[PDB]
Design a protein around this nucleic acid. Sequence first.
DNA 1: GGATGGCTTCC
DNA 2: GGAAGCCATCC
Lengths: 227, 305, 424
Amino acid sequence: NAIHIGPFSITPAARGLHYGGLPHHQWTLYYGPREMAIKTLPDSYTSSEVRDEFSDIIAEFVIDARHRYAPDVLELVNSDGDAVLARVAVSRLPEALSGCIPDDRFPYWLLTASRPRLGLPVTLNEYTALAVELSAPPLAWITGLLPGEVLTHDAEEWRPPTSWELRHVVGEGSFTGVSGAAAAALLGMSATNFRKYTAGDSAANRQKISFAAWHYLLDRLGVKRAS
Amino acid sequence: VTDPEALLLLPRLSIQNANAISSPLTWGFPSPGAFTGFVHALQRRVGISLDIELDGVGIVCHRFEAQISQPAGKRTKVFNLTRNPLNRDGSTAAIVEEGRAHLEVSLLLGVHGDGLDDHPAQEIARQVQEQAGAMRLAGGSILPWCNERFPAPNAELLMLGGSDEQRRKNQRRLTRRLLPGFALVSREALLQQHLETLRTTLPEATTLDALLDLCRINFEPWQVRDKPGWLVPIPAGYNALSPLYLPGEVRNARDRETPLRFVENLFGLGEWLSPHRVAALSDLLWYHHAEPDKGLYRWSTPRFV
Amino acid sequence: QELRQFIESFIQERLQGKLDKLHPDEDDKRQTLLATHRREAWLADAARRVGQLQLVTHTLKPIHPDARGSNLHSLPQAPGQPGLAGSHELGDRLVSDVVGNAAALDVFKFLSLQYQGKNLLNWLTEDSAEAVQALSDNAEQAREWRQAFIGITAVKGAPASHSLAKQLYFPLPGSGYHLLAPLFPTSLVHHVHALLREARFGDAAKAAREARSRQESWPHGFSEYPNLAIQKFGGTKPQNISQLNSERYGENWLLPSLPPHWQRQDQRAPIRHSSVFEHDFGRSPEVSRLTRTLQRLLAKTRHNNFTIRRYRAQLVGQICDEALQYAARLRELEPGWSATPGCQLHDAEQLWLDPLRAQTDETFLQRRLRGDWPAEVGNRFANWLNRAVSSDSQILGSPEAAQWSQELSKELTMFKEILEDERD
DNA sequence: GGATGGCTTCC
DNA sequence: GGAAGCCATCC
């Protein structure tokens, strides 16, 4: 019997062995089609023990994925160049930047955090406009694990996600950590009609989600801003 | 409470099968009460036959080795036992648990009596070494000479002889032969200080010595706040549980000519430190002083700070 | 009142549980007779069992199971010397454990369960009318039960010890000795075993664990204990100490009390050029932890500058003492001084920081190393330490960083003086 | 696995 | 008789 923790799966190996006189079994931890770890555990283990045998590897993978796909940071500096006044984490670049060094001609500059800086001079009202427009949700790093073609705004290239992609955000094992019931209440549906979406295969009574419901759900969970 | 005249150094003492537990709470190094009783029994051996009284001990613990193992599924450790012989009918013994270990220590002994007056000092050190080489420390029998013939001789050092700079020179050249071991003190003052800084939170006493020596991980304001020294808990001694009882009035004693009392262990916190951090080497002698009007039975090293 | 009816219902439930192990031959009539005798005279059968049991806080059987002596229930007074650990520290939350017969332990557990609900746990001595009205015991049966409960609450022991206790000596000031028999505390270790279980297990503990996995910092603490040792009491059945040993399953966790370097690992003293370069850094486990703590303590403020300066001075002194101790352990741990092939700067440091000139070393090189002590090795070590500590212009521009540089210079001067006194 | 005994159960 | 011994059963 498998165990499912979000997009991860833990399966046994169908024929045990005797190590030290006691019967054991090999277990494998998968992330989609990629095998990550293998352990040998005895029997008389409940599923919670098999869970927290691998919990640390799960947490480390979460830490690395969070650090790698972190969004970019802009900052607001005065006319000298140092003494950053405020920071903001954006999800896109404001498209007018070109490599700059601040001088005394203007009292406010908006630079990047990367080292060969790009920058722009602002006047504290357009800065608020850019902060409103280009900001990033708190869980924007989950978008680094998604295929992109399920994330576009254009309706012509979009395709509905599969169940394995959909388990990245919904379910108690997912990275947002939200339930199916709470996500169903977030869309104004029943729990059963929402469970219809996450069956596993469309032949076994499963429907695709809509474009609008998918983007609105990504909006309400704080993953994609979806203006 | 009294300053000795000369300092005696026991060079390199290697023990096997010393008792590891020595406490109802701890299992590491044995209590210094074993050392104080050891030099008391040594004074009862040949100390009174040479017009010498002995007062205090210094310990450095050159190396350590405990016969312990890890049971492959957790982070605790189980002790290693031995096989007792068979029972009366030949079935099986009853299992009691005990911890064995191997030590390397050196002893620093203070001398109050007529050191250089009656005899030369080196013959005194040689004969007390020859006497001490037939005893045991904490159940651990003393190993004899092994092929290190180099730490065979002892040394006697009058502490206050000569000039002040001469005192610094002889204490430094005695410290030079005491490099790899770590001396151990009492730390009741820092314990009282952290009591009063923790009494600002709440008035508890044993939770102090619980909390002061664990890996305490504070939340992010993932920090681990730290103590400056190597603070290790230690049994301070005993507190009474019964009145003073007559030498005959209690059944099944060792000897019926000695008063008797029931006791419970008292605990404290020590610290392991390098000998080069202290300047006065006479600050390092453990003294068991009894207070029989109450229950306070106490070994410590005073005049250390 | 209702407590005696609850005791009768518990006796009927025990009779039904004794009828659950029913035999098809003759178990029904024997079970009916036992249930009738129980529902008749449970209190009369339990008085003789409650006469056999005694409440105790210190026990002699954990010292050895074959010995038998005086077991004492007593809370001694707080000593005069402040800052200690004993049973006197807590009085409100005690839990006494009893030694006796197993059916007597069942009777005592029934008496304690009847002691709950109402105030019977403290009112088992002072109660006649409601207790005799509830339990179905008469006035004479209630008086005999009160006498038996007052007797079971008493100690009822003779002062004697055994031959397998410890009973050690302790010398008196300028005079003889006393005999000192130690007793195993059980209430204290039950209390701290509960506290240690609560430390290692609990919703707050696992919540702080997943917090420190996710570094979400809500206001909460997190405790951790390393390298406990585990002891087992007696054979397979643990309850022969008490019922506290039954609920602790014969297990007591012991705290570590170890010397600092209790894992004697092999030394990488040998002549590697990159080995000599890394040994100039000297990356070790405790040294790496101290370097991480010193790097984390760099970004502090000056509002706690007294305590921050004290902690920085203590960390610097501990780092210097650990470096001197590691150098002494590497030197004395070295059996002989070998000519290192390509030990880049390792020979220049090990002219003084290495062992004496042996047969593998030249006598003229040994005389030259005795001619000049390694002051330049101390300068290189101070340079490597100052490179290990991350510095910036905030310390150069601030006065606290100047005071920290002065303290580091004083520590480096003390280390150079200690090296030059032994050197040469 | 220590504790207490109860009818046997020797000598 | 009394003790001791074994076995037994309790928890």
